Amino acid sequence: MTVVPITSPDLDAAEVSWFAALCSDDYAYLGVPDDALKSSFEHCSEIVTRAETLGFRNILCPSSYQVGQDTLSFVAACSQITERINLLAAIRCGEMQPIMLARTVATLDHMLKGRLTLNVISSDFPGEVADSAFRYRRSHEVVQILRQAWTRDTIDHEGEVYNFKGVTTEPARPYQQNGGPLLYFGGYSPDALELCGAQCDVYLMWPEPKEQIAERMKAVHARAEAHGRTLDYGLRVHMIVRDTEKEARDYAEHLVSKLDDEADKFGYVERHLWTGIGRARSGCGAALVGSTDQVLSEIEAYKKMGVRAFIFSGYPHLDEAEHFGKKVLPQLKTCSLPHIYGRVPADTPATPLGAGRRH
Amino acid sequence: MTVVPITSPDLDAAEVSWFAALCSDDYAYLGVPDDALKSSFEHCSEIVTRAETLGFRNILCPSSYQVGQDTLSFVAACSQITERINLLAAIRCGEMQPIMLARTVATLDHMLKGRLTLNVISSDFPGEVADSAFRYRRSHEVVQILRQAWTRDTIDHEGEVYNFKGVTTEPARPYQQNGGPLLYFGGYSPDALELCGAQCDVYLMWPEPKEQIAERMKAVHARAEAHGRTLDYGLRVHMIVRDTEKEARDYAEHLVSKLDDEYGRLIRSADKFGYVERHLWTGIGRARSGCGAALVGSTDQVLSEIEAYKKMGVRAFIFSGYPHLDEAEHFGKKVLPQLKTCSLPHIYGRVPADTPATPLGAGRRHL
């Protein structure tokens, strides 16, 4: 039995993903800036193309005002050098006028032939501070506008931030059908839980002991159930996988060995969940750490709870992609959630940018 | 002597450009929808790669809420299939949060190694209406913020729409140096002239008889001079160029031959729509595309018109035609090889010879 009812209860595969490190995220030693691991297009596109070759099924492309690649530019450029991997594009509600966001989503979705998933985030614009309550109300409007673009002939939306009447959706029709691209996002505040329950397809959870993950799932499922919906569930977590547990635990100590700063005595909050990486304030505060078979057993345990998406990362990002991609990924049943959900048409759809008749 | 002082007075070349038709602009017959000419990524990227091979030096990528390609998405994708053509990206002030616009510009500029020019536009967002005065005030703020990103360590901007204090420019440092990417834009209203005089590098003019173009140049130069600046000048115009004038004039009639409009009905069963100058045809204005006239003539007549515009002070030409690929081949094979061409970013010294010491380039990464 899963902790809560999930959208994909008979799916026995998982969408196993990497992380494109677009925001100065890549390191050989945590806290040590390395020019050769900067978030240049050359480096970040290499993470994507390598992840694709290794058989990762999606890749989280973060968005923040840090040295690196604008997320939607990066996704557009990657469309021309990828063929199979999904991309999970962080989009911050309100940062782009939402009708033009819908047109950008339709443009990228046709460039990718439906290999697009969206990570809806609700944080502040760079150099601006807006109250949380307002940011979440604005996120509801932006997502409602996107979902109208994907499903209706016109956008008709009367809200606090935006007001549109009779705006044609023709320039914003995505490649994906049966509802459009999937939304993967998380958050823990009451306002985030309400936005996730009302609008997310995949609820992304940051790493916590399993007892606490179970409560996270019940908390968001109570909001989904109030909207007559179920969710699927994702885990965001760093990765250190090696032939032996000792090699993996030694690598974790190696990663924090230069942090020059002030859990059990070893930084573990659970048998294979290492929070030592939390000292780096990377944005993801824990790693799964163990042998190949231990990491496989942890993935099985998260699957039994109801997790069907894993967004992994490691240090350096290319080197841990190879470890995980060569040791663990061949042993896993993987899927593409857009495909499982029936969003990706087998043939070019009759959209304005596809095979549709021009008017 | 040029009509007005220009920024590039000794330049005897021009930046000769095509148009990527990102907004359902492409037709074989005006007013006749053709599925094969839709603004799909495959079709529009082919206009760009063909324009590059032919030797065009820049290409205008328009931005509007019409079936086609989001401009900055399109430019990012094209970065990976081009190496020498500049791209001229239409950006609408306020449509993206301006700090993230700066970061997007820095991303694209490094993907393109400095082959980016920006067409700053001040029109409404889709589904929205804001008064013209307010849209021009907002355009000043957005351009001011971009120029701070390109020239300063931090953005410090206290304005009506935007207020930023001490925001690092590190995530928004462009590839281009010595002021950053060039801005190409136009407009005729008092507020547009003031924005152009204060902030444009290239003043883009839509097609008019030469005497009126000269008045456009004087009118905007008066605002540039008030800011202690000079501009360079671009002409946006459609193109029909053939071995003989007859073939060209016959093709113009062919392009409007299926247009089921008022004038089309009268002719099938003229002051507004005809030749306003021997080689300037406004009949294409019946199609209500971006651009209401074409240069129409023989190769020799079109070369003569280009030389006449250059003598006035024009150093950029943004051409288009129908179909967009077919007229690129006509112009690109018949006229373009006979022209001295340049890249204005290069003329202006914006493009470093070597990878610059930027955070995305060869710069030292800091924590």
XYZ file of C-alpha atoms in Angstrom:
726
model
C 0.000 0.000 0.000
C 1.285 3.531 -0.863
C 1.177 6.155 1.955
C -1.625 7.964 0.009
C -3.498 7.181 -3.224
C -1.290 8.197 -6.218
C -2.175 9.101 -9.815
C -0.096 6.154 -11.207
C -0.800 3.276 -8.758
C -0.054 0.458 -11.313
C 3.131 2.134 -12.691
C 6.071 -0.140 -11.619
C 8.744 2.147 -13.236
C 10.023 5.576 -12.139
C 11.078 8.716 -14.007
C 14.707 8.853 -12.905
C 16.275 12.279 -13.512
C 19.469 14.318 -13.136
C 20.088 18.033 -12.459
C 21.598 20.542 -14.985
C 23.284 22.819 -12.380
C 22.364 26.040 -14.264
C 22.905 28.270 -11.182
C 26.557 27.907 -10.108
C 25.633 24.549 -8.447
C 28.613 22.410 -9.663
C 31.593 21.658 -7.319
C 34.339 19.027 -6.812
C 34.620 20.178 -3.140
C 31.632 21.937 -1.532
C 32.361 25.626 -0.819
C 35.295 25.657 -3.344
C 34.569 27.658 -6.541
C 36.035 25.839 -9.594
C 36.200 27.721 -12.972
C 36.059 24.401 -14.955
C 32.666 23.573 -13.237
C 31.019 27.030 -13.828
C 27.439 27.070 -15.223
C 28.555 27.970 -18.804
C 26.379 26.742 -21.689
C 29.251 24.329 -22.690
C 29.350 22.723 -19.194
C 25.579 22.644 -18.430
C 24.675 21.335 -21.935
C 27.326 18.575 -21.415
C 25.464 17.526 -18.184
C 22.213 17.310 -20.258
C 23.739 15.370 -23.236
C 25.639 12.997 -20.896
C 22.489 12.439 -18.742
C 20.608 11.612 -21.995
C 23.248 9.066 -23.216
C 23.322 7.426 -19.728
C 19.520 6.920 -19.940
C 18.190 9.564 -17.473
C 14.550 10.284 -18.412
C 14.306 13.949 -17.273
C 16.613 16.683 -15.909
C 15.744 19.553 -13.548
C 16.839 22.943 -14.980
C 16.763 25.360 -12.007
C 15.998 29.096 -12.241
C 17.648 31.736 -10.051
C 19.546 35.025 -10.358
C 22.995 33.406 -10.065
C 25.814 33.141 -12.620
C 24.595 30.590 -15.170
C 22.000 29.904 -17.846
C 18.546 31.469 -18.111
C 16.321 28.352 -17.800
C 14.007 28.819 -20.817
C 16.941 29.960 -23.100
C 18.890 26.876 -21.899
C 15.934 24.531 -22.638
C 15.501 26.106 -26.145
C 19.252 25.674 -26.933
C 19.185 22.057 -25.554
C 16.160 21.207 -27.819
C 18.642 21.313 -30.771
C 21.193 18.807 -29.202
C 18.807 16.283 -27.477
C 16.361 13.696 -28.907
C 15.034 11.609 -25.939
C 15.492 13.122 -22.433
C 12.657 15.232 -20.969
C 13.609 18.661 -19.576
C 12.084 19.998 -16.362
C 12.143 23.789 -16.662
C 11.863 25.932 -13.524
C 9.475 28.831 -14.276
C 8.822 31.569 -11.689
C 5.195 32.761 -11.747
C 4.879 36.400 -12.908
C 8.527 36.757 -14.064
C 7.236 36.763 -17.694
C 3.827 38.166 -18.777
C 1.730 34.964 -18.586
C 0.253 35.039 -22.137
C 3.800 35.312 -23.556
C 4.854 32.573 -21.047
C 2.106 30.389 -22.659
C 3.510 31.237 -26.166
C 7.066 30.433 -24.927
C 5.804 27.093 -23.528
C 4.139 26.285 -26.912
C 7.406 27.252 -28.755
C 9.618 25.059 -26.489
C 7.083 22.184 -26.492
C 7.150 22.049 -30.337
C 10.987 22.435 -30.393
C 11.147 19.406 -27.974
C 8.242 17.368 -29.573
C 6.645 17.180 -26.099
C 9.874 16.491 -24.006
C 8.921 19.451 -21.712
C 7.858 19.387 -18.054
C 7.484 22.558 -15.969
C 8.665 23.184 -12.385
C 6.392 26.008 -11.166
C 8.129 28.144 -8.491
C 6.640 31.002 -6.496
C 9.735 32.789 -5.060
C 10.554 36.529 -5.410
C 11.833 38.186 -8.604
C 15.514 39.224 -8.331
C 15.920 42.514 -6.433
C 12.249 42.455 -5.304
C 10.380 41.381 -2.134
C 6.673 40.472 -2.293
C 4.746 38.863 0.568
C 4.335 35.067 0.418
C 0.492 35.206 0.406
C 0.516 37.485 -2.688
C 3.139 35.336 -4.493
C 0.996 32.180 -4.044
C -2.210 33.999 -5.250
C -0.232 35.183 -8.348
C 1.031 31.547 -8.892
C -2.640 30.256 -8.931
C -3.484 32.877 -11.646
C -0.399 32.069 -13.783
C -1.044 28.291 -13.640
C -4.803 28.787 -14.342
C -3.849 30.920 -17.416
C -1.388 28.236 -18.663
C -4.001 25.440 -18.225
C -6.569 27.537 -20.221
C -3.965 28.019 -23.029
C -3.545 24.192 -23.076
C -7.270 23.241 -23.040
C -9.484 26.153 -24.316
C -9.938 28.312 -27.483
C -9.602 31.561 -25.461
C -8.141 32.791 -22.151
C -10.894 34.276 -19.916
C -9.367 35.050 -16.523
C -10.454 37.748 -13.972
C -8.013 37.924 -11.042
C -6.165 40.273 -8.673
C -2.942 40.424 -10.812
C -4.179 39.590 -14.354
C -7.411 40.191 -16.286
C -7.753 38.685 -19.826
C -10.959 38.466 -21.898
C -11.341 36.500 -25.125
C -7.582 36.200 -25.823
C -7.080 33.536 -28.564
C -5.009 30.511 -27.415
C -3.917 29.792 -31.041
C -0.370 31.223 -30.502
C -0.023 29.279 -27.167
C -1.219 25.736 -28.207
C 1.307 23.229 -26.890
C 2.532 20.046 -28.574
C 1.346 17.950 -25.616
C -2.377 17.018 -25.597
C -4.888 15.645 -23.019
C -4.221 18.623 -20.669
C -0.773 19.743 -21.871
C 2.668 19.579 -20.193
C 3.000 18.117 -16.662
C 3.712 20.396 -13.675
C 6.237 19.120 -11.063
C 6.613 21.286 -7.941
C 6.638 21.199 -4.151
C 6.640 23.404 -1.057
C 5.614 22.896 2.530
C 3.756 26.083 3.640
C -0.071 25.961 3.792
C -0.230 28.218 0.651
C 2.264 25.926 -1.250
C 0.285 22.800 -0.193
C -2.936 24.421 -1.545
C -1.249 25.352 -4.873
C 0.231 21.795 -5.121
C -3.121 20.102 -4.229
C -5.057 22.279 -6.741
C -2.499 22.354 -9.630
C 0.596 20.092 -9.409
C 0.775 16.763 -11.289
C 3.954 15.651 -9.466
C 4.590 16.825 -5.875
C 8.364 17.247 -5.378
C 9.658 16.461 -1.876
C 13.076 17.448 -0.536
C 14.915 14.769 1.453
C 13.689 13.943 5.011
C 13.497 10.659 7.019
C 10.754 8.344 5.574
C 8.386 8.872 8.600
C 8.376 12.618 7.807
C 8.060 12.069 4.016
C 4.900 9.993 4.815
C 3.407 13.004 6.720
C 4.417 15.335 3.809
C 2.466 13.084 1.376
C -0.655 12.930 3.630
C -0.540 16.761 4.153
C -0.491 17.565 0.390
C -2.903 14.661 -0.483
C -5.508 16.217 1.911
C -5.379 19.378 -0.344
C -5.462 17.301 -3.611
C -8.478 15.289 -2.275
C -10.374 18.571 -1.517
C -10.004 19.415 -5.307
C -11.110 15.889 -6.367
C -7.510 15.163 -7.535
C -4.662 12.719 -6.817
C -0.948 13.482 -7.260
C 2.154 11.518 -8.183
C 5.198 12.068 -5.907
C 8.845 12.932 -6.582
C 11.960 12.891 -4.404
C 14.694 15.515 -4.850
C 17.946 14.189 -3.276
C 21.739 14.196 -3.847
C 23.452 10.874 -4.675
C 26.693 9.133 -3.724
C 26.642 5.529 -5.038
C 29.796 3.301 -5.053
C 30.678 -0.440 -5.326
C 31.038 -0.512 -1.469
C 29.271 1.509 1.260
C 32.655 2.513 2.690
C 33.786 4.150 -0.645
C 30.483 6.126 -0.704
C 30.675 7.244 2.982
C 34.370 8.192 2.452
C 33.380 10.258 -0.635
C 30.779 12.175 1.459
C 33.546 13.135 3.978
C 35.779 14.113 0.975
C 33.021 16.465 -0.406
C 32.782 18.477 2.878
C 36.551 18.215 3.676
C 37.322 21.891 2.625
C 34.165 23.574 4.050
C 36.179 25.474 6.792
C 33.019 25.926 9.011
C 31.462 24.905 12.405
C 22.235 13.754 12.792
C 24.534 10.986 14.288
C 28.377 11.511 14.796
C 28.663 10.842 10.968
C 25.935 13.350 9.724
C 23.308 10.616 9.000
C 19.595 11.281 9.900
C 18.642 7.825 8.565
C 20.590 4.661 7.630
C 21.525 5.925 4.120
C 20.434 9.598 4.303
C 23.429 11.936 4.823
C 22.616 15.585 5.849
C 26.318 16.663 5.988
C 25.802 18.197 2.511
C 23.274 20.543 4.285
C 26.326 22.478 5.656
C 27.021 23.662 2.021
C 23.490 25.317 1.712
C 23.323 23.974 -1.963
C 19.440 24.013 -1.888
C 19.204 20.189 -1.370
C 20.197 19.302 2.219
C 20.791 15.502 1.945
C 22.249 12.655 -0.157
C 21.429 8.973 -0.489
C 24.804 7.401 0.333
C 25.651 3.727 -0.076
C 26.626 0.783 -2.230
C 24.759 0.168 -5.517
C 22.476 -2.432 -3.824
C 21.747 -0.110 -0.823
C 20.758 2.739 -3.209
C 18.546 0.308 -5.208
C 16.862 -0.819 -1.916
C 16.241 2.851 -0.911
C 14.664 3.564 -4.364
C 12.413 0.452 -3.912
C 11.405 1.730 -0.428
C 10.463 5.209 -1.815
C 8.547 3.479 -4.665
C 6.587 1.339 -2.130
C 5.556 4.648 -0.400
C 4.252 5.938 -3.788
C 7.242 7.928 -5.235
C 7.407 7.615 -9.094
C 9.935 10.418 -9.866
C 13.525 10.867 -8.580
C 15.549 14.022 -9.250
C 19.150 13.122 -8.380
C 22.331 15.205 -8.357
C 25.901 14.804 -7.118
C 29.397 16.291 -7.115
C 30.867 16.794 -9.582
C 27.547 16.653 -11.500
C 29.052 14.808 -14.528
C 31.124 12.320 -12.429
C 28.136 11.342 -10.174
C 25.850 11.041 -13.285
C 28.342 8.413 -14.595
C 28.489 6.532 -11.231
C 24.693 6.430 -10.875
C 24.132 6.050 -14.634
C 26.545 3.032 -14.932
C 25.941 1.304 -11.505
C 22.217 1.893 -10.697
C 20.318 3.146 -13.788
C 20.706 -0.049 -15.961
C 19.135 -2.022 -12.980
C 16.029 0.274 -12.816
C 12.744 0.197 -14.771
C 12.360 3.841 -15.942
C 9.583 5.765 -17.683
C 8.717 9.219 -19.052
C 5.780 10.593 -17.056
C 4.528 12.749 -19.993
C 4.223 9.439 -21.956
C 2.686 7.462 -18.978
C 0.111 10.307 -18.623
C -0.708 10.168 -22.414
C 0.312 13.846 -22.941
C 2.781 13.154 -25.824
C 0.963 12.355 -29.103
C 2.619 9.478 -31.074
C 2.245 11.571 -34.326
C 2.651 15.368 -34.905
C -0.545 16.885 -33.504
C -2.854 19.180 -35.555
C -1.629 22.275 -33.630
C -0.919 25.652 -35.264
C 2.871 25.001 -34.971
C 2.395 21.285 -35.872
C 0.203 19.787 -38.639
C -2.746 22.198 -37.977
C -4.393 24.041 -40.893
C -3.237 27.679 -41.015
C -6.060 30.319 -40.830
C 27.152 64.645 -47.051
C 24.675 62.509 -45.022
C 21.252 64.092 -44.169
C 22.424 64.244 -40.494
C 25.662 63.354 -38.664
C 25.868 59.524 -38.160
C 27.726 57.326 -35.665
C 29.663 55.508 -38.451
C 30.504 58.331 -40.932
C 33.574 56.624 -42.511
C 31.855 53.198 -42.866
C 31.478 52.460 -46.634
C 29.745 49.080 -45.918
C 26.215 48.328 -44.657
C 24.782 45.676 -42.346
C 22.473 43.936 -44.855
C 19.871 41.757 -43.125
C 16.887 39.460 -43.719
C 13.764 38.735 -41.628
C 12.923 35.415 -39.838
C 9.066 35.680 -40.181
C 8.437 34.345 -36.626
C 4.840 35.750 -36.508
C 2.906 34.040 -39.367
C 4.562 36.540 -41.815
C 5.344 34.067 -44.657
C 3.128 33.836 -47.818
C 3.422 32.851 -51.505
C 0.303 34.978 -52.263
C -0.597 37.800 -49.845
C -3.840 37.001 -47.965
C -3.514 33.236 -48.765
C -2.628 31.028 -45.755
C -0.070 28.376 -46.773
C 0.589 25.498 -44.298
C 4.095 24.913 -45.829
C 5.092 28.561 -44.923
C 3.827 28.564 -41.262
C 6.174 30.040 -38.592
C 7.260 26.568 -37.313
C 10.773 26.229 -35.810
C 11.795 24.093 -38.851
C 10.668 26.789 -41.366
C 11.882 29.917 -39.461
C 15.267 28.296 -38.553
C 15.690 27.450 -42.260
C 15.185 31.183 -43.131
C 17.987 31.978 -40.580
C 20.468 29.258 -41.730
C 19.800 30.043 -45.452
C 20.225 33.819 -44.772
C 23.538 32.995 -43.016
C 24.859 30.794 -45.916
C 23.833 33.477 -48.475
C 25.960 35.980 -46.476
C 23.302 38.193 -44.774
C 24.884 39.893 -41.725
C 21.882 40.134 -39.352
C 18.233 38.929 -39.270
C 15.274 40.611 -37.590
C 13.340 38.187 -35.321
C 9.960 39.909 -34.628
C 7.975 39.510 -31.381
C 4.154 39.455 -31.298
C 1.253 37.288 -30.031
C 0.715 35.468 -33.348
C 1.213 31.762 -34.264
C 4.986 31.277 -34.420
C 8.192 31.301 -32.384
C 8.765 33.128 -29.112
C 11.663 35.480 -30.092
C 14.210 34.827 -27.305
C 13.471 31.024 -27.351
C 14.015 31.101 -31.136
C 17.322 33.028 -30.782
C 18.584 30.521 -28.123
C 17.723 27.526 -30.394
C 19.312 29.279 -33.441
C 22.563 29.898 -31.406
C 23.268 26.141 -31.824
C 22.860 26.096 -35.709
C 24.548 29.464 -36.623
C 28.157 30.776 -36.292
C 28.447 34.067 -38.266
C 25.045 35.789 -38.744
C 23.966 38.333 -36.119
C 20.417 37.973 -34.764
C 18.234 41.012 -34.050
C 15.848 39.973 -31.279
C 12.659 41.994 -30.705
C 12.139 42.474 -26.941
C 9.059 44.263 -25.529
C 9.876 46.425 -22.481
C 8.270 45.063 -19.283
C 7.148 41.724 -20.800
C 9.909 39.995 -18.729
C 11.116 41.195 -15.280
C 14.046 43.387 -16.366
C 16.789 41.822 -14.142
C 15.871 38.379 -15.556
C 15.770 40.023 -19.054
C 19.384 41.136 -18.378
C 20.294 37.536 -17.326
C 18.538 36.196 -20.467
C 20.466 38.689 -22.641
C 23.771 37.589 -20.966
C 22.851 33.890 -21.560
C 21.990 34.457 -25.257
C 25.026 36.770 -25.801
C 27.412 34.004 -24.544
C 25.538 31.289 -26.556
C 26.010 33.536 -29.668
C 29.601 34.763 -28.817
C 28.359 38.366 -29.243
C 26.130 37.835 -32.390
C 23.167 39.478 -30.547
C 21.482 42.807 -31.332
C 18.231 43.898 -29.628
C 15.143 45.501 -31.224
C 13.526 47.355 -28.272
C 9.727 47.667 -28.703
C 7.273 49.520 -26.479
C 3.851 48.090 -27.559
C 1.163 46.516 -25.303
C 1.466 43.053 -23.755
C -1.016 40.570 -25.318
C -4.509 40.935 -23.865
C -3.535 44.223 -22.128
C -3.862 47.980 -22.802
C -1.581 50.607 -21.207
C -1.424 54.246 -22.344
C 1.409 55.102 -24.784
C 2.980 57.713 -22.415
C 3.308 55.059 -19.641
C 4.713 52.412 -22.058
C 7.453 54.877 -23.245
C 8.342 55.822 -19.604
C 8.611 52.086 -18.776
C 10.793 51.514 -21.930
C 13.289 54.197 -20.647
C 13.518 52.348 -17.275
C 14.027 48.901 -18.907
C 16.794 50.180 -21.258
C 18.443 52.094 -18.353
C 18.461 48.825 -16.311
C 19.942 46.817 -19.251
C 22.696 49.432 -19.805
C 23.543 49.307 -16.030
C 23.817 45.470 -16.307
C 26.207 45.930 -19.277
C 28.436 48.672 -17.739
C 28.244 48.564 -13.874
C 28.991 46.209 -10.914
C 25.485 46.732 -9.439
C 22.051 47.952 -10.636
C 20.883 51.068 -8.720
C 17.644 52.297 -10.344
C 14.841 54.264 -8.569
C 11.940 54.734 -11.025
C 8.160 54.723 -11.433
C 7.792 51.000 -12.352
C 11.049 49.454 -11.052
C 13.163 50.063 -7.953
C 16.428 48.047 -7.614
C 19.151 48.772 -5.009
C 22.598 47.143 -4.963
C 21.617 44.217 -7.269
C 24.834 42.464 -8.481
C 25.228 42.514 -12.320
C 27.428 39.345 -12.152
C 24.570 37.074 -13.455
C 23.775 39.637 -16.257
C 27.291 40.416 -17.681
C 27.067 40.164 -21.475
C 29.697 38.781 -23.854
C 29.837 42.107 -25.715
C 32.005 44.836 -24.129
C 32.405 48.641 -24.500
C 28.700 49.255 -23.654
C 27.236 45.810 -24.513
C 24.806 44.752 -27.315
C 23.562 47.321 -29.875
C 19.916 48.505 -29.745
C 18.093 48.925 -33.091
C 14.607 50.495 -32.947
C 12.366 53.217 -34.350
C 9.038 55.008 -33.905
C 7.738 58.401 -34.991
C 5.783 59.756 -31.951
C 7.401 62.430 -29.740
C 7.922 59.840 -26.955
C 9.485 57.295 -29.439
C 11.812 60.016 -30.865
C 12.945 60.883 -27.311
C 13.545 57.172 -26.459
C 15.448 56.712 -29.791
C 17.525 59.927 -29.338
C 18.416 59.013 -25.721
C 18.944 55.220 -26.089
C 18.924 53.708 -29.637
C 22.182 52.896 -31.469
C 20.453 52.247 -34.856
C 17.244 54.188 -35.685
C 15.003 51.881 -37.770
C 12.834 53.578 -40.406
C 9.866 51.978 -42.173
C 9.652 52.700 -45.894
C 8.681 56.179 -47.194
C 9.757 58.365 -50.166
C 13.404 59.583 -49.735
C 12.367 63.224 -48.950
C 10.250 61.920 -45.989
C 13.053 59.565 -44.838
C 15.374 62.670 -44.729
C 12.761 64.434 -42.479
C 12.596 61.306 -40.226
C 16.420 61.420 -39.871
C 16.439 65.166 -38.988
C 13.548 64.751 -36.506
C 15.210 61.920 -34.488
C 18.732 63.462 -34.832
C 17.354 66.636 -33.095
C 16.616 64.372 -30.014
C 19.992 62.501 -30.271
C 21.811 65.890 -30.440
C 19.918 67.045 -27.260
C 21.580 64.013 -25.463
C 25.023 64.775 -27.018
C 24.686 61.563 -29.145
C 24.673 60.532 -32.818
C 22.747 57.566 -34.261
C 23.236 55.179 -37.155
C 20.186 54.612 -39.423
C 18.450 51.489 -40.754
C 15.775 51.030 -43.423
C 13.180 48.257 -43.019
C 11.632 47.444 -46.438
C 10.304 44.451 -48.450
C 12.233 43.383 -51.591
C 11.360 42.202 -55.100
C 14.597 42.042 -57.163
C 14.769 40.346 -60.614
C 17.135 40.404 -63.662
C 14.681 42.884 -65.336
C 12.333 45.550 -63.921
C 9.442 43.924 -65.850
C 9.884 40.533 -64.038
C 9.986 42.381 -60.673
C 6.885 44.537 -61.374
C 5.046 41.419 -62.705
C 5.934 39.550 -59.474
C 4.468 42.444 -57.394
C 1.143 42.091 -59.331
C 1.379 38.256 -58.811
C 1.818 38.718 -54.979
C -1.450 40.750 -54.705
C -3.296 38.746 -57.460
C -5.394 36.637 -54.954
C -5.906 39.356 -52.279
C -9.747 39.428 -51.756
C -9.666 43.070 -50.409
C -11.665 46.178 -51.584
C -8.994 47.327 -54.131
C -8.468 43.667 -55.312
C -12.266 43.321 -55.946
C -12.346 46.645 -57.984
C -9.281 45.571 -60.159
C -10.583 41.903 -60.580
C -14.073 43.248 -61.639
C -4.371 53.351 -56.278
C -3.131 56.639 -54.599
C -2.885 54.544 -51.315
C -1.558 51.373 -53.045
C 0.883 51.725 -55.993
C 4.338 53.213 -56.717
C 5.032 56.186 -54.365
C 8.518 56.369 -55.994
C 9.850 54.728 -59.182
C 11.009 51.630 -57.209
C 9.009 51.935 -53.951
C 5.752 49.924 -54.159
C 3.076 50.354 -51.390
C 0.725 47.667 -52.863
C 2.173 45.221 -50.298
C 0.536 47.556 -47.684
C -2.843 45.929 -48.610
C -1.547 42.785 -46.748
C -1.101 44.830 -43.454
C 2.201 42.867 -42.675
C 4.795 44.690 -40.437
C 5.954 46.665 -43.470
C 3.902 48.619 -46.038
C 6.319 48.935 -49.038
C 8.848 47.012 -51.173
C 11.871 48.052 -53.221
C 10.910 46.689 -56.666
C 13.262 46.589 -59.647
C 16.124 45.054 -61.590
C 19.340 44.089 -59.734
C 20.963 47.346 -61.039
C 17.983 49.503 -59.860
C 18.036 47.880 -56.380
C 21.862 48.431 -56.115
C 21.265 52.082 -57.173
C 18.515 52.510 -54.484
C 20.818 50.992 -51.777
C 23.665 53.382 -52.804
C 21.171 56.308 -52.646
C 20.090 55.328 -49.077
C 23.787 54.876 -48.070
C 24.590 58.415 -49.390
C 21.788 59.741 -47.080
C 23.460 58.005 -44.061
C 21.718 54.561 -43.911
C 24.173 51.819 -42.704
C 21.626 49.004 -42.005
C 19.049 47.374 -44.342
C 16.446 44.908 -43.007
C 14.919 43.243 -46.101
C 12.135 40.662 -46.465
C 10.045 39.236 -49.307
C 7.571 36.557 -50.373
C 8.100 33.728 -49.954
C 10.809 34.637 -47.373
C 13.256 31.862 -48.464
C 12.673 32.442 -52.242
C 13.259 36.231 -52.039
C 16.340 35.667 -49.758
C 17.814 33.556 -52.633
C 16.922 36.214 -55.284
C 18.440 39.082 -53.254
C 21.184 36.952 -51.755
C 22.410 35.674 -55.190
C 21.705 38.766 -57.383
C 22.448 41.801 -55.152
C 24.188 40.772 -51.870
C 27.543 39.569 -53.416
C 27.940 43.050 -55.093
C 27.582 44.899 -51.728
C 30.267 45.804 -49.132
C 28.740 44.375 -45.911
C 29.625 44.665 -42.227
C 28.526 43.635 -38.712
C 27.687 46.778 -36.728
C 28.551 45.113 -33.369
C 32.096 44.576 -34.863
C 32.279 48.155 -36.371
C 31.268 49.553 -32.938
C 33.963 47.424 -31.140
C 31.327 45.589 -28.999
C 32.563 42.071 -29.928
C 35.834 41.107 -28.141
C 38.340 39.206 -30.384
C 39.002 36.778 -27.466
C 36.598 35.161 -24.930
C 36.048 37.972 -22.421
C 36.772 37.658 -18.659
C 33.003 37.486 -17.891
C 31.438 35.139 -15.304
C 30.081 32.958 -18.189
C 33.332 33.364 -20.223
C 36.940 33.207 -18.904
C 36.197 35.172 -15.669
C 37.288 33.808 -12.246
C 34.373 32.091 -10.458
C 33.863 33.559 -6.914
C 31.718 32.192 -4.010
